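Preliminary data (for renewal application), zinc ion complex.
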Amino acid sequence: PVIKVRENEPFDVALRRFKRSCEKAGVLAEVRRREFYEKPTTERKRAKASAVKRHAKKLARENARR
Amino acid sequence: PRRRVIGQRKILPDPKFGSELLAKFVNILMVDGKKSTAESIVYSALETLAQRSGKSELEAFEVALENVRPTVEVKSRRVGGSTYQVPVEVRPVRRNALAMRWIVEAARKRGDKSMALRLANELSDAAENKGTAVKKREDVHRMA
Amino acid sequence: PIAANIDQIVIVSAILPELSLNIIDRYLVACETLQIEPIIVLNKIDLLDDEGMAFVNEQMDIYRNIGYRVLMVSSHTQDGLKPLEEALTGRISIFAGQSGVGKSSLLNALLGLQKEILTNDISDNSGLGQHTTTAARLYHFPHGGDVIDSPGVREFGLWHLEPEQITQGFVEFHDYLGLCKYRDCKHDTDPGCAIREAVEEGKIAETRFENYHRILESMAQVKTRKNFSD
Amino acid sequence: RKQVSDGVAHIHASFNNTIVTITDRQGNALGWATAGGSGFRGSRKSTPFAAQVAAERCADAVKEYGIKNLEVMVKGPGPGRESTIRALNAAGFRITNITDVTPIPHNGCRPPKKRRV
Amino acid sequence: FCRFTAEGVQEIDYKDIATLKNYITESGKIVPSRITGTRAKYQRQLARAIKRARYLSLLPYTDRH
RNA sequence: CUUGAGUCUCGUAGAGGGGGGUAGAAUUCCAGGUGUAGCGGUGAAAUGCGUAGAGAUCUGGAGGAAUACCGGUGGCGAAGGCGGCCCCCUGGACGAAGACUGACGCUCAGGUGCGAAAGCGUGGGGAGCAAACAGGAUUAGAUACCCUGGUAGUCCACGCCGUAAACGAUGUCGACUUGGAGGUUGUGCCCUUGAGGCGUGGCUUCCGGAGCUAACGCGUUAAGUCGACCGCCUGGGGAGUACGGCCGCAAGGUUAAAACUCAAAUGAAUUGACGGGGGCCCGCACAAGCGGUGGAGCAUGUGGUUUAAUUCGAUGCAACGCGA
Ligand SMILES: Nc1nc2c(ncn2[C@@H]2O[C@H](COP(=O)(O)OP(=O)(O)NP(=O)(O)O)[C@@H](O)[C@H]2O)c(=O)[nH]1
Ligand SMILES: [Mg+2]
Ligand SMILES: [Mg+2]
Ligand SMILES: [Mg+2]
Ligand SMILES: [Mg+2]
Ligand SMILES: [Mg+2]
Ligand SMILES: [Mg+2]
Ligand SMILES: [Mg+2]
Ligand SMILES: [Mg+2]
Ligand SMILES: [Mg+2]
Ligand SMILES: [Mg+2]
Ligand SMILES: [Mg+2]
Ligand SMILES: [Mg+2]
Ligand SMILES: [Mg+2]
Ligand SMILES: [Mg+2]
Ligand SMILES: [Mg+2]
Ligand SMILES: [Mg+2]
Ligand SMILES: [Mg+2]
Ligand SMILES: [Mg+2]
Ligand SMILES: [Mg+2]
Ligand SMILES: [Mg+2]
Ligand SMILES: [Mg+2]
Ligand SMILES: [Mg+2]
Ligand SMILES: [Mg+2]
Ligand SMILES: [Zn+2]
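Predicted structure:
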């Protein structure tokens, strides 16, 4: 979020570090996931589905070679 | 090209200046395969251009096309699912052709009774960044 | 088909259930394609105030200015039916229109059928009325001829009709066929569209032109079905 | 009219409009622009280039204040956040400090329903 | 990674502000355990300590405040 | 009698429960400061708000509700469920070692209790959200989706309701049966120890062997192999309906038919077809180009119209300088 410029620093590098900082916090994803209410049932189902997809991907990572 | 991005073929230099760009110019100006008419027109226009610009007529052609060559142009993209314009840079080989194309069409629009004269006049105004050839280049830069 | 061996249709519209310069135009196009003589009636003028009557007549005249028989009748007060009765005599007339417009009530008033037997009549609620009459029944006119009560309808869309048949259906367009410089003149923005300028100077009803265009574009939406209509 | 010589550029990058204001470091406003008041309307209004325009549209009317350096506080998800300050630097302004002040609640309030688009 | 267990710590202390501040971002957010490498019980102790510190204003809740 | 069951001693982890404080963001509102002309919203708009000064920004205030990050395939609880921090009261589980009692056990018709959300009663509270409703758009209509508002409700106290796809669609308890990779939480030994290696418990996740299953799949947390007890089923509709009983303030809940009607209804899986489902890979399909057609005159074919006859056939691509 907060990025303070130094003396004799090009403005472009300051811009790029500020944007990469703000996107390191994922603030845009935060303000977008809080735009509309999400019933906890849908939240739970999507979280669980993402998790099982992650498990299946990590399984495919190690079942091909073995 | 969906599958094979084929390479472009080579053009032969012009028998009066050995200049690949001049040959490309006459190939662009050509109409109905009448190469001889085109070469007559281009040599006449180059020589009168030389008379106004003094020495180095082939070089005068080079700087004329330079003063109107495009750097940035709008490009269409359907990735969004709707028509989307984007400003993009142009490779040198392509902007050469774009400059030549803009020159020849502008000359045809000029009229005044002779293609030789139209081409020469457009080239002469192009050499000094004028003649509306630069204005068409300027407007497509503004559209970035 | 709704009813056969018909001689005349009477487009029954009413201000309260819905006012639709679009359904009337769709009906006019249809009956023109079917060569049946139409007639426009507007029911329930009792609801409109005298100012409102002068506000509805100066666009009901749109059709009487192209010859269409346009009448205004109040079924509840039996007001101005008498010319409708005259126009109904000795012909076969199907009463058509949206649900709630008063087609059944108009028939009760005109036929003067015995009190024991009357058509179902429920009042409209909120935006649109119920569909009371779900049948098509013939009735013998007292003086002469026959009428037919029909069920109310929502969409009289015309995807079966060819696009040219819609230009023919608008009777105020024959005065300008072949006057467009582009022969295949879609007439919307094509240069030299005669009816474009015709409606620019007020020769044509703007609402009619817009309705023509919008029903054309409606046919594009309903051409999705691959079923056949021949 | 009065040269503070130092100040702050506050941005407001909504998905509909971008609001760029200038003020003293104390929050009393001097000049403010908007992509809406910039002659861009509708989908044309919510464009990054519209915010880039509003940048100068704000910078001009505070030349009398003539703040030399400035710190920018951008808040909002709307497109154009970076382009306003990119344009502002192209106007000769020097950015002392960039910072994001996007309001984030800790689960404080119920947001509106999901649009069944 | 897993420095706490590696030092066999018994309880993480909220009062320390030099040690556990290696576990928050500049925005003051508790860094997840996937990257700090700390273990579950110690991650929970860390979160509780950090919230305690926040309450007594030794650590900021956010960079803004 | 002590092996099942239970007690005691010492510790561990935990959004377990009830009550009370408190914190920091954020929304809204009020008041004030700066200051201009728009704000807001959509695919696009409009309604709406703003010159009395909106929106923006700063300061102060008020109120309600919820606790980003931690956060997890994590934990706890009989289930429903439980998420800031702290205090008070309180339930369960697990581990090591040892002592203690001595079958004290399992299941459970009736019965009792708990029990998401919505809803009901009384009384508070009400920021945001939002059935109903008001309005603007779209549309035949929009009575919907979208937009601007917005009441009950959502929160608290006390009662009532007692139902959910209350689901793992898998009753409880016990025993036995090949393996692998994890997560979490105890604990022993050995290490030079952080590490690290040997073990040994609890809960939990994903594969998979035998075996089982209609198949899908289950697979030591079985849907395997067996015991004990309970609940439930007997084709699809009619119907979880009628009547009666009980319960409820009411909404309704529970128990629960029959007449009548059909030869099906259904579960899994197979092949294809289709999708306003995805992944592609090609094609002058598009893009990039060059020249056209579409306007004019004429040539020619066709439709139509005409005619005594304008012979017949070809009619989306794939008929129309076609048979000819
Ligand atoms: N105020 C008013 N109401 C009228 C008038 N004529 C008829 N109505 C009422 O409007 C309603 C029309 O219902 P009905 O006649 O069945 O409608 P319909 O147009 O025949 N079609 P549908 O059967 O589908 O409803 C009835 O309540 C009728 O009594 C009239 O002149 N004024
Ligand atoms: Mg009727
Ligand atoms: Mg279909
Ligand atoms: Mg909204
Ligand atoms: Mg003994
Ligand atoms: Mg019982
Ligand atoms: Mg409730
Ligand atoms: Mg209540
Ligand atoms: Mg009340
Ligand atoms: Mg709403
Ligand atoms: Mg409307
Ligand atoms: Mg309480
Ligand atoms: Mg049940
Ligand atoms: Mg069940
Ligand atoms: Mg069983
Ligand atoms: Mg029991
Ligand atoms: Mg398995
Ligand atoms: Mg039966
Ligand atoms: Mg019942
Ligand atoms: Mg192309
Ligand atoms: Mg032609
Ligand atoms: Mg023929
Ligand atoms: Mg034949
Ligand atoms: Mg041919
Ligand atoms: Zn026309």
